[PDB]
DNA sequence: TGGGACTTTTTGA
DNA sequence: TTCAAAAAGTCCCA
């Protein structure tokens, strides 16, 4: 039989809206294996022949149809065993379907539909006497009330994040969640945390999830909660691996247990070229098992509210820079995030755009895009920003709002500030303050392959698509722009920054201040020098008909220095 | 269809 | 009053 085949016929006659608001989206077969294998393997179904199995948010039952079949084998093999221990009558290979259906295997589910696809799959795995009660709830498994406790929980939560879910679930998970979900955390944390809570002492649960509650700051609770309840046995991180075909999103295996042991140490795989094709393999096991993964562990009792998840070399390298840096970026500079227009169609225009022409320039500002920010240097602006919080009335700026801004007034009104009343239907939603923009400050994409830090010159603006800083005044005596984006751009502060930060999809990570605000900075005898090179590069990379080769040979000095700085 | 360039505004706090 | 986080990303193309 194939266990995936309507599953996903059924997943396929789905719209992307319905697949989206409930997290329809289906686990491939060497993922299913791969913790079906881990949960089960090494069970003893003589010492306990009624383990409960559970998958809360089961699906058509891509996890259920394989623990179904594996938990065949396992009394199958052993059916003569269990004969001689327990009721010979009841333990024959006739009576093993049935068996499994009453005791073995539990489901739940929201989805009506594929609750009844899976009850026909269970169904059908025997040509068949009493109609046999099957264990499929349809419920939200985060209301249910939970009667018992399980051995095993396998499965693949749904991901559903702040803008996605509705207001008042959203009221109900703040009020009933609070320990792992709050601000902008995510529906699969509460599934951590109810799948924790029902499993039994001495149970295992193995889940793939999303990757990102292992370093966002969303999860910190969620971190605490795990740690705190659980021995984590093992983290499968995949980075920004394609696990889903067609979805982008970034994965991660976790499998816990709460057994009693003194164990506390954590097996860690973590791809290495995320260019792989998983589903191009027989089993993730031998993936594993391969030079394609790195292998290293982790002391479970040395976790902090962060989970720094490196090799050794890596850990020496991050705390050889922590212990010898002084200062932070949060320390000397102030943070923030760019402008949110809420509709930037309605603002922002090519400057070239004829229409500017009805636009006084005391109003137009300097638009940026995450594109435009290189190291130490930004792209000349190809856009403008109608700054139309300074429209002092309508009738004065006239036809600035009728020709431009309000053709999308419908859409300006169903800002939510507007509807309350706090912003006039063609103000920018967070204007932020002009001052902070216009003043010589660095800038840095906020999702980058790389760590690219520059200097903008030109008060440029932007939206939340570009973070920018500035040094404090006390500090300026200390650091300067140049030997920032010096350090900030070097290969050495690339790999530190990356060692803690938040990998978001293939050769993506986000560089947030939640994050870039921890980078750790010094200065000692080598500082002159890093300045002089970074001011070296800066004025070739700003000279119009320069070819900027040289650049890669004074960075190549620069990342020298700062090794030696940092004794790595 | 799978891979690469690129990134809005809704939202809780 | 007003901050900053959040990929079951978006979107285009060979
Ligand atoms: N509140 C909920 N309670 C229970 N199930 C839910 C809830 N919300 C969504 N679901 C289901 O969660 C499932 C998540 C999917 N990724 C299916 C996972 C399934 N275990 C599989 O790996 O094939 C979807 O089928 C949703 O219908
Ligand atoms: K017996």
């Given at each position: 039989?194939?266990?995936?085949?309507?599953?996903?016929?059924?997943?396929?006659?789905?719209?992307?809206?319905?697949?989206?608001?409930?997290?329809?989206?289906?686990?491939?077969?060497?993922?299913?294996?791969?913790?079906?294998?881990?949960?089960?393997?090494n069970?003893?179904i003589?010492?306990?022949?009624?383990?409960?199995?559970?998958?809360?948010?089961?699906?058509?039952?891509?996890?259920?149809?394989?623990?179904?079949?594996?938990?065949?084998?396992?009394?199958?093999?052993?059916?003569?065993?269990?004969?001689?221990?327990?009721?010979?009558?009841?333990?024959?290979?006739?009576?093993?379907?049935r068996?499994?259906?009453?005791?073995?295997?539990?489901?739940?589910?929201?989805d009506?539909?594929?609750?009844?696809?899976?009850?026909?799959?269970?169904?059908?795995?025997?040509?068949?006497?009493?109609?046999?009660?099957?264990?499929?709830?349809?419920?939200?498994?985060?209301?249910?009330?939970?009667?018992?406790?399980?051995?095993?929980?396998?499965?693949?939560?749904?991901?559903?994040?702040?803008?996605?879910?509705?207001?008042?679930?959203?009221?109900?998970?703040?009020?009933?969640?609070?320990?792992?979900?709050?601000?902008?955390?995510?529906?699969?944390?509460?599934?951590?945390?109810?799948?924790?809570?029902?499993?039994?002492?001495?149970?295992?649960?193995?889940?793939?999830?999303?990757?990102?509650?292992?370093?966002?700051?969303?999860?910190?609770?969620?971190?605490?909660?795990?740690?705190?309840?659980?021995?984590?046995?093992?983290?499968?991180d995949?980075?920004?691996?394609?696990?889903?075909?067609?979805?982008?999103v970034?994965?991660?295996?976790?499998?816990?247990?709460?057994?009693?042991?003194?164990?506390?140490?954590?097996?860690?795989?973590?791809?290495?070229?995320?260019?792989?094709?998983?589903?191009?393999?027989?089993?993730?096991?031998?993936?594993?098992?391969?030079?394609?993964?790195?292998?290293?562990?982790?002391?479970?009792?040395?976790?902090?509210?962060?989970?720094?998840?490196?090799?050794?070399?890596?850990?020496?390298?991050?705390?050889?820079?922590?212990?010898?840096?002084?200062?932070?970026?949060?320390?000397?500079?102030?943070?923030?995030?760019?402008?949110?227009?809420?509709?930037?169609?309605?603002?922002?225009?090519?400057?070239?755009?004829?229409?500017?022409?009805?636009?006084?320039?005391?109003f137009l500002?300097?638009?940026?895009?995450?594109?435009?920010?290189?190291?130490?240097?930004?792209?000349?602006?190809?856009?403008?920003?109608?700054?139309?919080?300074?429209?002092?009335?309508?009738?004065?700026?006239?036809?600035?709002?009728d020709?431009?801004?309000?053709?999308?007034?419908?859409?300006?009104?169903?800002?939510?500030?507007?509807?309350?009343?706090?912003?006039?239907?063609?103000?920018?939603?967070?204007?932020?303050?002009?001052?902070?923009?216009?003043?010589?400050?660095?800038?840095?994409?906020?999702?980058?392959?790389?760590?690219?830090?520059?200097?903008?010159?030109?008060?440029?603006?932007?939206?939340?698509?570009?973070?920018?800083?500035?040094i404090?005044?006390?500090?300026?005596?200390?650091?300067?722009?140049?030997?920032?984006?010096?350090?900030?751009?070097?290969?050495?502060?690339?790999?530190?920054?990356?060692?803690?930060?938040?990998?978001?999809?293939?050769?993506?990570?986000?560089?947030?201040?939640?994050k870039?605000?921890?980078?750790?900075?010094?200065?000692?005898?080598?500082?002159?020098?890093?300045?002089?090179?970074?001011?070296?590069?800066?004025?070739?990379?700003?000279?119009?008909?320069?070819?900027?080769?040289?650049?890669?040979?004074?960075?190549?000095?620069?990342?020298?220095?700062?090794?030696?700085?940092?004794?790595?």
């Amino acid at each position: 039989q194939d266990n995936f085949l309507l599953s996903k016929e059924y997943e396929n006659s789905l719209d992307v809206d319905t697949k989206k608001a409930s997290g329809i989206y289906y686990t491939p077969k060497i993922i299913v294996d791969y913790i079906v294998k881990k949960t089960l393997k090494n069970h003893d179904i003589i010492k306990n022949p009624y383990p409960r199995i559970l998958d809360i948010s089961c699906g058509c039952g891509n996890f259920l149809l394989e623990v179904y079949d594996i938990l065949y084998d396992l009394f199958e093999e052993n059916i003569y065993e269990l004969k001689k221990k327990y009721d010979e009558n009841y333990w024959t290979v006739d009576n093993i379907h049935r068996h499994i259906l009453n005791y073995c295997i539990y489901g739940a589910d929201i989805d009506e539909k594929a609750i009844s696809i899976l009850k026909d799959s269970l169904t059908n795995k025997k040509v068949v006497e009493s109609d046999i009660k099957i264990n499929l709830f349809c419920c939200d498994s985060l209301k249910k009330k939970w009667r018992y406790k399980f051995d095993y929980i396998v499965g693949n939560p749904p991901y559903i994040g702040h803008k996605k879910l509705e207001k008042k679930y959203k009221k109900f998970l703040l009020e009933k969640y609070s320990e792992v979900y709050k601000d902008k955390a995510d529906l699969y944390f509460c599934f951590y945390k109810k799948i924790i809570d029902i499993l039994k002492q001495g149970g295992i649960g193995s889940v793939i999830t999303p990757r990102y509650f292992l370093e966002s700051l969303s999860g910190k609770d969620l971190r605490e909660y795990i740690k705190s309840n659980v021995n984590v046995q093992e983290i499968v991180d995949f980075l920004g691996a394609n696990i889903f075909k067609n979805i982008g999103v970034s994965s991660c295996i976790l499998t816990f247990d709460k057994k009693k042991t003194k164990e506390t140490y954590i097996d860690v795989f973590k791809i290495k070229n995320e260019d792989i094709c998983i589903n191009k393999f027989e089993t993730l096991e031998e993936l594993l098992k391969s030079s394609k993964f790195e292998h290293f562990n982790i002391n479970q009792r040395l976790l902090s509210d962060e989970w720094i998840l490196v090799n050794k070399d890596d850990e020496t390298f991050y705390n050889k820079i922590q212990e010898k840096c002084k200062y932070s970026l949060e320390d000397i500079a102030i943070s923030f995030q760019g402008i949110i227009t809420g509709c930037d169609k309605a603002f922002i225009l090519s400057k070239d755009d004829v229409k500017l022409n009805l636009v006084d320039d005391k109003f137009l500002k300097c638009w940026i895009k995450s594109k435009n920010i290189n190291k130490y240097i930004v792209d000349k602006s190809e856009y403008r920003l109608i700054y139309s919080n300074d429209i002092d009335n309508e009738n004065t700026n006239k036809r600035i709002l009728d020709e431009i801004i309000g053709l999308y007034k419908t859409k300006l009104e169903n800002r939510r500030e507007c509807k309350s009343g706090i912003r006039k239907w063609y103000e920018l939603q967070w204007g932020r303050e002009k001052l902070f923009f216009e003043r010589k400050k660095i800038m840095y994409p906020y999702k980058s392959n790389e760590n690219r830090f520059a200097i903008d010159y030109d008060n440029n603006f932007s939206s939340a698509d570009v973070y920018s800083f500035f040094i404090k005044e006390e500090y300026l005596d200390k650091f300067s722009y140049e030997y920032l984006v010096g350090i900030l751009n070097s290969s050495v502060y690339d790999k530190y920054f990356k060692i803690t930060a938040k990998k978001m999809s293939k050769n993506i990570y986000d560089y947030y201040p939640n994050k870039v605000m921890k980078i750790r900075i010094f200065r000692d005898n080598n500082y002159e020098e890093i300045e002089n090179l970074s001011k070296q590069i800066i004025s070739i990379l700003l000279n119009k008909s320069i070819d900027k080769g040289k650049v890669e040979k004074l960075q190549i000095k620069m990342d020298n220095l700062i090794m030696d700085s940092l004794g790595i």
